[PDB]
DNA sequence: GCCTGTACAGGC
DNA sequence: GCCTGTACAGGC
């Protein structure tokens, strides 16, 4: 797979554990940080830190591929296929009409909080639909080539960190979801 | 692998997991949501008892079971319904069903009981998911469901030398093996 | 369907489409991007000549062809390389290749020429894609490419009673049939 | 890198 | 609604 938001799961929904995120369908892989098939596209990713060169500005963030040089295969190629431009594994690519691209469900996890004030203070939060604007190769903090992506928010649902996003969370009563018995 | 029949090495009867993804990663029941795993032209490998069909009856060592749709439509002996029927040591019959006189010679089914079965079974665990061992399909048959449409029904009977968790000896063995509820890492 | 061999009913030699999606919807060459359509244990149904390998030579009625993989790895007689070899009326041989004495008995390949082949062929159309008819694999062989790695090469030869678009009679027939560049619905109106 | 379906191999 | 690969059926 499903592209785009999950019905009944609005932006700002929160889960304590990744197993809950998986069961909800927002980000199916229990461990892996990106969900995609190389011959299709990418459906979801989790921002949980781990790459110091990534920048998180909320509506704009950069993302580093997985994965000794990296190849535009597996999930890296899948995320590229979301970009509204023909696939290119040499210089990368960029979409002028980036909004016509394939949607990516983005979840932020608390572990992204070291380098980003947009990360939730606890657990995992669904932050809405982002689009791949461009992607390119570069020599990262390991000497070898990494594939990097710029994603931009494209969602009428306001961001959880914005005024209208925080007001909607209070109106819907969306609180942190804990598994039965955990509390 | 996906089509493994029988017990998983290192996973005794009584093993407990909190979440379905753990049950899947262990190989005991691979589908995260579907209640049954099988291939329609091969057989069924595992099923999860989680409530749902009120006419199902669970007596631990054996239970009646209901197939799937895919109520507003007759069920069919296709897909996983057919897979489970193939386990019965009898020729497929999608008209009247069939019964294996030599039922132990049929294909094994790993059976997990889930906490949600507790509303309709005193054998469901109080939490999470529990592997209760190997069962065999004795017989299967169609009947008019509660809504007037056809459902496929199955009788499964336990064929496992590891004692059931509802027995004193099965509880004692589970304690000596040190089995505890397994949670995801860092939980 | 996907694995249809031979000409498409209602699609003569000389038919022209501006974009690859149109060529695909017609059944003539179904892959939008891949230059060859085939199943590795069956055969190849169609291919597109769009340039790309410098040592390929195109003489219209026949051409040399290179399979798929700067090359950094030997080619292999698998996937669509193997499918095209299977069209050759000879036992498959992945060591020296093979050659069919009775090459017309081989399986047919629908051949499309695309404008990008014009740099290396005077037979490419000036615009878009053109169906040029049925060809047969005469022979195929491995050789060292310019990179020094192995490439699989093929010789394809035309076996089609519809005259080639590069002949006077072929052009004249294309005119009488009224064939024109096919564009997507409302394409020129939007431009 | 046709498309929407379906199914198997193998994961552990 | 296990996963990610692969392959075929059939579109027109």
UniProtKB/Swiss-Prot annotation, chain C:
| Cross-link annotation Glycyl lysine isopeptide (Lys-Gly) (interchain with G-Cter in SUMO2), location | 122
Q: Which chain positions carry the site (Required to confer preferential recognition of cytosine over thymine)?
A: 66
Domain YDG, chain residue ranges per copy:
6-158
Post-translation changes? Ubiquitinated; which leads to proteasomal degradation. Autoubiquitinated; interaction with USP7 leads to deubiquitination and prevents degradation. Polyubiquitination may be stimulated by DNA damage.
| Inducing factors | Up-regulated in proliferating cells, and down-regulated in quiescent cells. Down-regulated upon adriamycin-induced DNA damage, in a p53/TP53 and CDKN1A-dependent way. Induced by E2F1 transcription factor.
Region described as Required to promote base flipping: 32-33
Q: Where in the cell is it found?
A: Nucleus
Q: Which residues carry this modification: N6-acetyllysine?
A: 122
User: What, per the annotation, is the impact of changing residue 35 to D?
Assistant: Decreased affinity for DNA
Q: Tissue expression, per UniProt?
A: Expressed in thymus, bone marrow, testis, lung and heart. Overexpressed in breast cancer.
What domain of life does the UniProt record list for this protein's source? Answer: Eukaryota
Positions of the region Required for formation of a 5-methylcytosine-binding pocket? 53-56, 65-68
What does its UniProt record remark on the domains?
A: The tudor-like regions specifically recognize and bind histone H3 unmethylated at 'Arg-2' (H3R2me0), while the PHD-type zinc finger specifically recognizes and binds histone H3 trimethylated at 'Lys-9' (H3K9me3). The tudor-like regions simultaneously recognizes H3K9me3 through a conserved aromatic cage in the first tudor-like subdomain and unmodified H3K4 (H3K4me0) within a groove between the tandem subdomains.
Q: How does it assemble?
A: Interacts with DNMT3A and DNMT3B. Interacts with DNMT1; the interaction is direct. Interacts with USP7; leading to its deubiquitination. Interacts with histone H3. Interacts with HDAC1, but not with HDAC2. Interacts with BLTP3A. Interacts with PML. Interacts with EHMT2. Binds hemimethylated CpG containing oligonucleotides. Interacts with ZNF263; recruited to the SIX3 promoter along with other proteins involved in chromatin modification and transcriptional corepression where it contributes to transcriptional repression. Interacts with UHRF2. Interacts with FANCD2.
Purpose: Multidomain protein that acts as a key epigenetic regulator by bridging DNA methylation and chromatin modification. Specifically recognizes and binds hemimethylated DNA at replication forks via its YDG domain and recruits DNMT1 methyltransferase to ensure faithful propagation of the DNA methylation patterns through DNA replication.
What protein name is recorded for this chain? E3 ubiquitin-protein ligase UHRF1
Question: What species was this sequence derived from?
Answer: Homo sapiens
What gene is behind this protein?
A: UHRF1
């Amino acid at each position: 797979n499903h592209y785009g938001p999950i019905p009944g799961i609005p932006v700002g929904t929160m889960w304590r554990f990744r197993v809950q995120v998986s069961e909800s369908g927002v980000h199916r892989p229990h461990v892996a940080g990106i969900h995609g098939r190389s011959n299709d596209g990418a459906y979801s990713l989790v921002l949980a830190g781990g790459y110091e060169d990534d920048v998180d500005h909320g509506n704009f963030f950069t993302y580093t591929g997985s994965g000794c040089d990296q190849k535009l295969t597996n999930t890296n190629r899948a995320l590229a296929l979301n970009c509204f431009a023909p696939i290119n594994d040499q210089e990368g690519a960029e979409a002028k009409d980036w909004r016509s691209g394939k949607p990516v469900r983005v979840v932020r996890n608390v572990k992204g909080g070291k380098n980003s004030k947009y990360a939730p203070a606890e657990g995992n939060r669904y932050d809405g639909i982002y689009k791949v604007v461009k992607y390119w190769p570069e020599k990262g903090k390991s000497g070898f080539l990494v594939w990097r992506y710029l994603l931009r928010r494209d969602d009428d649902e306001p961001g959880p960190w914005t005024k209208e996003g925080k007001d909607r969370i209070k109106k819907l009563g969306l609180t942190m979801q804990y598994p039965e018995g955990y509390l």
